Design a protein around this ligand. Sequence first.
Ligand SMILES: Nc1ccn([C@@H]2O[C@H](COP(=O)(O)OP(=O)(O)O)[C@@H](O)[C@H]2O)c(=O)n1
Ligand SMILES: Nc1ccn([C@@H]2O[C@H](COP(=O)(O)OP(=O)(O)O)[C@@H](O)[C@H]2O)c(=O)n1
Ligand SMILES: [Ca+2]
Lengths: 234, 217
Amino acid sequence: FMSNEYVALITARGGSKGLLRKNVLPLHGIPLIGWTIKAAQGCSYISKVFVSTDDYEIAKISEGLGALVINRPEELATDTASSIDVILHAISWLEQKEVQKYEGMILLQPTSPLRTSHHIKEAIELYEKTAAKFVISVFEPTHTPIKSYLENDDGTISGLYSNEAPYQRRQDLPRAYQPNGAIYAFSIDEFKLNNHFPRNKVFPYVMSEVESADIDTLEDLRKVEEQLKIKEIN
Amino acid sequence: NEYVALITARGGSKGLLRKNVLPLHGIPLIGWTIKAAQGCSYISKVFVSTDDYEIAKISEGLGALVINRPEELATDTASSIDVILHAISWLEQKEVQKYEGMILLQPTSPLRTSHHIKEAIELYEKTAAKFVISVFEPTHTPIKSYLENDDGTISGLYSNEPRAYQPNGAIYAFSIDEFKLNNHFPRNKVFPYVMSEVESADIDTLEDLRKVEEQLK
Ligand SMILES: Nc1ccn([C@@H]2O[C@H](COP(=O)(O)OP(=O)(O)O)[C@@H](O)[C@H]2O)c(=O)n1
Ligand SMILES: Nc1ccn([C@@H]2O[C@H](COP(=O)(O)OP(=O)(O)O)[C@@H](O)[C@H]2O)c(=O)n1
Ligand SMILES: [Ca+2]
């Protein structure tokens, strides 16, 4: 169908495998998660923004900004909790609590603050243009994996893709992509058919390595702060 | 075994302007590679293949010999094979000395030292290799990436999910005679010279150059 509706889902847990409270850390005057909430809200194609959280501060920040809160069960906020299970829970919550029927879900990670409304807009346009079942934001690494080698038992090496691939121009080879975790745009119906992410009609939404920045440490956060400060003062 | 170093440096670039001649810790970028080739005992002569006046002036000034590269071989479309074949042809006409191996070195790898070149040539001799290429093991293994299919879709490169190496572009040590009979890089008896990710730094932007400057102070 030509006319489709989209819902944004932001998954942010309180706990972490590190000694960092990532999702609420200040970045250029606002909590980290705020950059992703605002990117979703700023996009014309997004009807509603939902934040799935178990945390009081994340929920408070989210509601304050105008996003809707999906109260996530304890089991789904553990270090062992599966990405699929959180999505299925959010799909279930939406089907029971939200009257609007959505074709696609735009899953967005709070750890990708350089992914903007413009990136979401473009990813949804690609999703529609290609008749995709799943659009994932990716980047082309500086050292492309299509030009890599694998080690043989005798200690020699051979091209992973082909024998001539490591010596060929990157432009003359199929492109190899690395997902950056910023955007996962998928058909809600196709996700709950296999109860997992679609395996077919998967298209890449290409972003630069610079815009692919993922927050894991205070250094990652410091680097992005400087980048935003540099764009501010020029 | 006698070895000739070939440094391929074109004037043009898709990104960073005058890349090969930009200052890095007191020396033009290319000078780090010229000096790393000259500092290695196994290297008899150092040649710089360029289409550029500035690169040639810097190279001659550092004592390297200049191979004047034709315009078509300095384009964005120009093949790696064609640049090497041209240098092989130039060497066979303009050089009385016969070399068994060619050590192809990129000026964009300034953290690759004489020590790294010595070790790659030692591996080349010890293994009786047809080809030795400097590599690194990336933090994100290439086997876990996606490959773009013909219809525009993506799927896992290797499978839907082994030791992987990524060439860093710093050193290519191969037999000249063997390269001439194949008109391509050897496909067998290829051994990896493993370097760290940190020493595998490649200059493409002013940020890459600034990062190397900082880890050079
Ligand atoms: N079961 C989980 C795991 C991570 N996440 C969130 O997904 C983002 C990226 O996860 P991450 O790689 O930083 O992992 P942790 O910080 O949770 O150790 C973070 O913003 C998490 O808050 C979640 O919502 N539910
Ligand atoms: N057709 C070409 C392309 C690159 N090169 C050189 O190969 C090195 C690395 O090239 P590169 O991958 O960064 O691409 P460009 O700088 O040419 O855009 C540089 O020192 C280039 O000057 C060359 O000699 N002939
Ligand atoms: Ca873009």
